Short mmCIF file of C-alpha atoms and ligand atoms in Angstrom, two decimals:
data_model
loop_
_atom_site.label_atom_id
_atom_site.label_comp_id
_atom_site.label_asym_id
_atom_site.label_seq_id
_atom_site.Cartn_x
_atom_site.Cartn_y
_atom_site.Cartn_z
CA UNK A 1 23.69 -7.11 -17.34
CA UNK A 2 25.30 -5.57 -14.26
CA UNK A 3 24.59 -8.49 -11.93
CA UNK A 4 22.97 -8.16 -8.54
CA UNK A 5 21.12 -5.02 -7.48
CA UNK A 6 21.19 -3.72 -3.91
CA UNK A 7 17.63 -4.96 -3.41
CA UNK A 8 18.59 -8.47 -4.44
CA UNK A 9 21.44 -8.37 -1.90
CA UNK A 10 18.96 -7.12 0.71
CA UNK A 11 16.57 -9.99 -0.01
CA UNK A 12 19.36 -12.59 0.09
CA UNK A 13 20.55 -11.29 3.47
CA UNK A 14 16.97 -11.22 4.74
CA UNK A 15 16.52 -14.89 3.81
CA UNK A 16 19.70 -15.74 5.75
CA UNK A 17 18.37 -14.31 9.03
CA UNK A 18 17.28 -16.47 11.92
CA UNK A 19 13.72 -16.04 13.15
CA UNK A 20 15.17 -13.98 16.00
CA UNK A 21 17.25 -11.75 13.72
CA UNK A 22 14.31 -11.40 11.33
CA UNK A 23 11.98 -10.42 14.19
CA UNK A 24 14.27 -7.70 15.55
CA UNK A 25 15.09 -6.38 12.07
CA UNK A 26 11.47 -6.26 10.84
CA UNK A 27 10.50 -3.16 12.86
CA UNK A 28 13.93 -1.68 13.60
CA UNK A 29 13.68 2.11 13.36
CA UNK A 30 10.38 2.12 11.45
CA UNK A 31 7.38 4.37 12.01
CA UNK A 32 4.25 2.77 13.42
CA UNK A 33 0.79 3.67 14.64
CA UNK A 34 -0.31 2.18 17.91
CA UNK A 35 -3.38 0.05 17.16
CA UNK A 36 -4.33 -0.87 20.75
CA UNK A 37 -7.32 1.46 21.08
CA UNK A 38 -8.68 0.61 17.62
CA UNK A 39 -8.23 -3.13 18.07
CA UNK A 40 -10.15 -2.99 21.37
CA UNK A 41 -12.97 -0.79 20.05
CA UNK A 42 -13.38 -2.88 16.88
CA UNK A 43 -13.55 -6.07 18.96
CA UNK A 44 -16.27 -4.43 21.07
CA UNK A 45 -18.23 -3.61 17.90
CA UNK A 46 -17.80 0.16 18.25
CA UNK A 47 -18.50 1.70 14.83
CA UNK A 48 -18.64 5.44 15.67
CA UNK A 49 -15.35 5.99 17.49
CA UNK A 50 -13.32 7.27 14.52
CA UNK A 51 -11.02 4.23 14.52
CA UNK A 52 -9.34 3.02 11.36
CA UNK A 53 -10.10 -0.60 10.49
CA UNK A 54 -6.45 -1.44 9.71
CA UNK A 55 -2.92 -0.01 9.62
CA UNK A 56 -3.60 0.83 5.98
CA UNK A 57 -5.40 4.08 6.74
CA UNK A 58 -2.22 5.50 8.27
CA UNK A 59 -0.15 4.39 5.28
CA UNK A 60 -2.45 6.23 2.87
CA UNK A 61 -2.64 9.23 5.22
CA UNK A 62 1.16 9.53 5.05
CA UNK A 63 1.03 9.81 1.25
CA UNK A 64 -2.03 12.07 1.09
CA UNK A 65 -0.92 14.55 3.77
CA UNK A 66 2.27 15.16 1.80
CA UNK A 67 0.49 15.67 -1.52
CA UNK A 68 1.99 12.55 -3.08
CA UNK A 69 -1.59 11.44 -3.85
CA UNK A 70 -4.59 13.81 -4.18
CA UNK A 71 -7.77 11.68 -4.31
CA UNK A 72 -10.89 13.06 -5.95
CA UNK A 73 -14.19 11.99 -7.50
CA UNK A 74 -14.91 8.28 -7.97
CA UNK A 75 -12.34 6.16 -6.08
CA UNK A 76 -11.81 2.49 -6.99
CA UNK A 77 -9.90 0.51 -4.34
CA UNK A 78 -8.62 -2.82 -5.70
CA UNK A 79 -7.70 -5.32 -2.99
CA UNK A 80 -9.42 -3.30 -0.28
CA UNK A 81 -9.13 -5.92 2.48
CA UNK A 82 -10.75 -4.64 5.66
CA UNK A 83 -11.13 -1.23 4.00
CA UNK A 84 -8.46 1.02 5.52
CA UNK A 85 -7.76 2.87 2.27
CA UNK A 86 -11.44 3.11 1.31
CA UNK A 87 -12.50 4.62 4.62
CA UNK A 88 -9.60 7.07 4.56
CA UNK A 89 -10.47 8.11 1.00
CA UNK A 90 -14.10 8.67 2.04
CA UNK A 91 -13.06 11.52 4.37
CA UNK A 92 -11.33 13.51 1.61
CA UNK A 93 -13.29 16.58 0.51
CA UNK A 94 -12.87 16.12 -3.26
CA UNK A 95 -13.81 12.41 -3.10
CA UNK A 96 -17.45 11.66 -3.92
CA UNK A 97 -17.75 7.85 -4.10
CA UNK A 98 -15.59 4.92 -2.95
CA UNK A 99 -15.94 1.39 -4.35
CA UNK A 100 -13.67 -1.25 -2.80
CA UNK A 101 -13.24 -4.84 -3.99
CA UNK A 102 -11.46 -7.71 -2.29
CA UNK A 103 -11.17 -11.48 -2.54
CA UNK A 104 -12.03 -12.42 1.04
CA UNK A 105 -12.32 -16.08 1.97
CA UNK A 106 -10.29 -18.30 4.30
CA UNK A 107 -7.07 -16.65 5.36
CA UNK A 108 -7.84 -13.29 3.75
CA UNK A 109 -9.08 -9.97 5.08
CA UNK A 110 -12.84 -9.35 4.94
CA UNK A 111 -14.32 -5.84 4.71
CA UNK A 112 -15.14 -4.30 8.09
CA UNK A 113 -18.29 -2.17 8.41
CA UNK A 114 -17.76 0.98 10.50
CA UNK A 115 -19.32 4.42 10.38
CA UNK A 116 -16.28 6.69 10.14
CA UNK A 117 -16.84 10.00 8.36
CA UNK A 118 -18.27 9.49 4.89
CA UNK A 119 -19.19 5.83 5.42
CA UNK A 120 -22.41 6.37 3.43
CA UNK A 121 -20.42 6.89 0.18
CA UNK A 122 -18.41 3.68 0.66
CA UNK A 123 -19.32 0.28 -0.78
CA UNK A 124 -17.00 -2.65 -0.06
CA UNK A 125 -17.47 -5.92 -1.96
CA UNK A 126 -15.89 -9.22 -0.92
CA UNK A 127 -15.72 -12.41 -2.97
CA UNK A 128 -14.27 -10.53 -5.96
CA UNK A 129 -11.17 -11.62 -7.90
CA UNK A 130 -9.99 -8.28 -9.29
CA UNK A 131 -7.95 -9.99 -12.02
CA UNK A 132 -11.25 -11.06 -13.61
CA UNK A 133 -12.92 -7.65 -13.20
CA UNK A 134 -13.44 -5.59 -16.35
CA UNK A 135 -11.75 -2.21 -15.94
CA UNK A 136 -14.03 0.82 -15.78
CA UNK A 137 -13.35 4.56 -15.69
CA UNK A 138 -12.65 6.21 -12.38
CA UNK A 139 -11.00 9.37 -11.11
CA UNK A 140 -8.74 7.85 -8.45
CA UNK A 141 -7.34 4.32 -8.79
CA UNK A 142 -6.00 2.56 -5.67
CA UNK A 143 -4.46 -0.90 -5.48
CA UNK A 144 -2.74 -2.43 -2.44
CA UNK A 145 -2.26 -5.98 -3.78
CA UNK A 146 1.00 -7.86 -3.44
CA UNK A 147 1.65 -10.68 -0.99
CA UNK A 148 5.20 -11.03 0.37
CA UNK A 149 7.21 -14.18 -0.38
CA UNK A 150 10.65 -15.38 0.61
CA UNK A 151 11.11 -16.25 -3.08
CA UNK A 152 12.08 -13.20 -5.18
CA UNK A 153 10.86 -14.97 -8.33
CA UNK A 154 7.44 -15.27 -6.69
CA UNK A 155 7.47 -11.61 -5.62
CA UNK A 156 8.47 -10.61 -9.15
CA UNK A 157 5.74 -12.74 -10.74
CA UNK A 158 3.17 -11.30 -8.32
CA UNK A 159 4.28 -7.72 -9.00
CA UNK A 160 4.17 -8.16 -12.79
CA UNK A 161 0.66 -9.53 -12.36
CA UNK A 162 -0.49 -6.47 -10.39
CA UNK A 163 1.13 -4.08 -12.86
CA UNK A 164 -0.40 -5.79 -15.89
CA UNK A 165 -3.83 -5.65 -14.27
CA UNK A 166 -3.66 -2.00 -13.19
CA UNK A 167 -2.50 -0.97 -16.66
CA UNK A 168 -5.99 -1.77 -17.96
CA UNK A 169 -7.49 0.58 -15.37
CA UNK A 170 -4.93 3.33 -15.98
CA UNK A 171 -5.82 3.17 -19.68
CA UNK A 172 -9.18 4.66 -18.64
CA UNK A 173 -7.24 7.78 -17.48
CA UNK A 174 -7.80 8.28 -13.75
CA UNK A 175 -6.08 11.49 -12.71
CA UNK A 176 -4.83 10.13 -9.38
CA UNK A 177 -3.49 6.70 -8.53
CA UNK A 178 -1.65 4.82 -5.78
CA UNK A 179 -0.39 1.32 -6.67
CA UNK A 180 1.56 -1.04 -4.43
CA UNK A 181 4.75 -2.30 -6.09
CA UNK A 182 5.73 -5.28 -3.95
CA UNK A 183 9.08 -5.95 -5.62
CA UNK A 184 10.48 -2.90 -7.46
CA UNK A 185 14.20 -3.62 -7.45
CA UNK A 186 15.13 -6.11 -10.17
CA UNK A 187 16.58 -4.68 -13.38
CA UNK A 188 13.65 -6.07 -15.38
CA UNK A 189 11.13 -4.55 -12.97
CA UNK A 190 12.82 -1.15 -13.04
CA UNK A 191 12.75 -1.07 -16.84
CA UNK A 192 9.04 -2.00 -16.69
CA UNK A 193 8.31 0.73 -14.16
CA UNK A 194 10.06 3.41 -16.22
CA UNK A 195 8.08 2.36 -19.30
CA UNK A 196 4.89 2.68 -17.22
CA UNK A 197 5.97 6.12 -15.97
CA UNK A 198 6.51 7.28 -19.54
CA UNK A 199 2.90 6.35 -20.36
CA UNK A 200 1.09 7.15 -17.08
CA UNK A 201 3.41 9.39 -15.01
CA UNK A 202 3.93 9.21 -11.27
CA UNK A 203 6.86 7.87 -9.28
CA UNK A 204 7.66 5.39 -6.53
CA UNK A 205 7.67 6.36 -2.85
CA UNK A 206 8.83 4.44 0.22
CA UNK A 207 6.42 4.90 3.14
CA UNK A 208 8.23 4.84 6.52
CA UNK A 209 5.36 2.83 8.06
CA UNK A 210 6.38 -0.10 5.84
CA UNK A 211 8.26 -2.86 7.67
CA UNK A 212 11.95 -3.48 6.90
CA UNK A 213 11.07 -7.04 5.88
CA UNK A 214 9.42 -5.87 2.64
CA UNK A 215 10.78 -3.70 -0.18
CA UNK A 216 7.28 -2.46 -1.10
CA UNK A 217 7.02 1.01 -2.62
CA UNK A 218 3.95 2.88 -3.81
CA UNK A 219 3.62 4.16 -7.37
CA UNK A 220 1.74 7.45 -6.89
CA UNK A 221 0.62 10.08 -9.38
CA UNK A 222 1.66 13.04 -7.23
CA UNK A 223 5.38 12.27 -6.73
CA UNK A 224 7.24 11.90 -10.04
CA UNK A 225 10.86 10.89 -9.59
CA UNK A 226 13.74 8.89 -11.04
CA UNK A 227 12.83 5.28 -10.20
CA UNK A 228 16.40 3.99 -10.55
CA UNK A 229 17.40 6.41 -7.80
CA UNK A 230 14.29 6.10 -5.61
CA UNK A 231 14.49 2.29 -5.53
CA UNK A 232 18.25 2.31 -4.90
CA UNK A 233 17.82 4.81 -2.05
CA UNK A 234 15.29 2.47 -0.41
CA UNK A 235 17.58 -0.55 -0.87
CA UNK A 236 20.46 1.32 0.78
CA UNK A 237 18.19 2.36 3.65
CA UNK A 238 17.04 -1.22 4.26
CA UNK A 239 20.57 -2.64 4.03
CA UNK A 240 21.94 -0.07 6.47
CA UNK A 241 19.31 -1.04 9.03
CA UNK A 242 20.61 -4.63 8.90
CA UNK A 243 23.80 -3.45 10.64
CA UNK A 244 24.22 -2.07 14.13
CA UNK A 245 21.80 -2.56 17.01
CA UNK A 246 18.04 -2.68 16.73
CA UNK A 247 16.66 0.83 16.81
CA UNK A 248 13.47 2.10 18.48
CA UNK A 249 10.15 2.19 16.68
CA UNK A 250 8.84 5.72 16.14
CA UNK A 251 5.24 5.35 17.38
CA UNK A 252 2.55 7.74 16.13
CA UNK A 253 -1.07 8.14 17.15
CA UNK A 254 -3.33 6.38 14.68
CA UNK A 255 -5.74 8.05 12.31
CA UNK A 256 -8.97 9.53 13.62
CA UNK A 257 -11.49 9.25 10.78
CA UNK A 258 -14.31 10.88 12.74
CA UNK A 259 -17.92 9.85 12.26
CA UNK A 260 -21.06 10.97 10.47
CA UNK A 261 -22.32 11.02 6.91
CA UNK A 262 -21.45 13.16 3.90
CA UNK A 263 -23.89 15.03 1.69
CA UNK A 264 -23.79 13.62 -1.86
N1 SAH B 301 -7.05 -11.46 -6.78
C1 SAH B 301 -7.48 -10.67 -5.79
N2 SAH B 301 -8.71 -10.05 -5.90
C2 SAH B 301 -9.16 -9.24 -4.88
N3 SAH B 301 -8.40 -9.03 -3.76
C3 SAH B 301 -7.19 -9.62 -3.66
C4 SAH B 301 -6.70 -10.45 -4.66
N4 SAH B 301 -5.47 -10.89 -4.27
C5 SAH B 301 -5.19 -10.35 -3.06
N5 SAH B 301 -6.25 -9.57 -2.68
C6 SAH B 301 -6.46 -8.80 -1.44
O1 SAH B 301 -5.80 -7.57 -1.42
C7 SAH B 301 -5.71 -7.15 -0.07
C8 SAH B 301 -4.39 -6.39 0.04
S1 SAH B 301 -4.09 -5.80 1.72
C9 SAH B 301 -5.20 -4.39 1.61
C10 SAH B 301 -5.10 -3.52 2.86
C11 SAH B 301 -5.91 -2.24 2.68
N6 SAH B 301 -5.22 -1.29 1.80
C12 SAH B 301 -6.23 -1.59 4.02
O2 SAH B 301 -5.91 -0.42 4.19
O3 SAH B 301 -6.81 -2.21 4.93
C13 SAH B 301 -5.76 -8.42 0.79
O4 SAH B 301 -6.87 -8.38 1.69
C14 SAH B 301 -5.92 -9.54 -0.22
O5 SAH B 301 -6.79 -10.56 0.23
#
């Protein structure tokens, strides 16, 4: 054992921040979409304005527009929340069907019904515990599950749980996948991830729309890389942003998902 990884040092420093320091650090220098227009239109019940239902659509757009994920066919979206990934996937030409599942209930996101482009091929189901769902074949497997915790043992336990569950779906051989890895940086987790890459491929990618307060990376089929290096690079990035003054957010215009239905 070589002791403490950079990500463990990052997490320990994060937990030593005051609420003020934490607040300024959380968005320092990150990329963000402005959600003002969408938030207003969704509150007014507007379903045809092209608005994304969450910040998640922009996160998936960042991966897809770079070719790190190429969705196609039957898309399964585990932990779909409001549906940002499912509605984004529905606009993609090679996608033909989107099934999203999410827990819902008090304190959790419920699916939002809008009519962005391709809404007629989307089915979102709440009240579903995905850890009790029998895996089934699909072409594209998405999972965005992993709730942040100030305890790294809790984040590790939660990440191992997600990875064990998605393994059963990946055994059905989807050709594309995008899996949130909440806590990728412990030595045990990195050995687990490399074993999973040897069986299923892919690599981990840091999305710049992620907040500095989480070390989340996305395991995606379209960006194979050395996970030791990709995780360490992200840890160094996040540690460096803890020094020096708070830096401006890079604001982007949010996703326009259009409107209308798709043929078959
Ligand atoms: N056991 C479980 N079964 C189903 N959903 C779960 C779950 N545990 C957590 N979740 C859900 O997974 C979601 C992850 S956040 C999903 C955001 C989504 N990608 C978007 O773009 O909008 C949360 O809404 C959470 O409630």
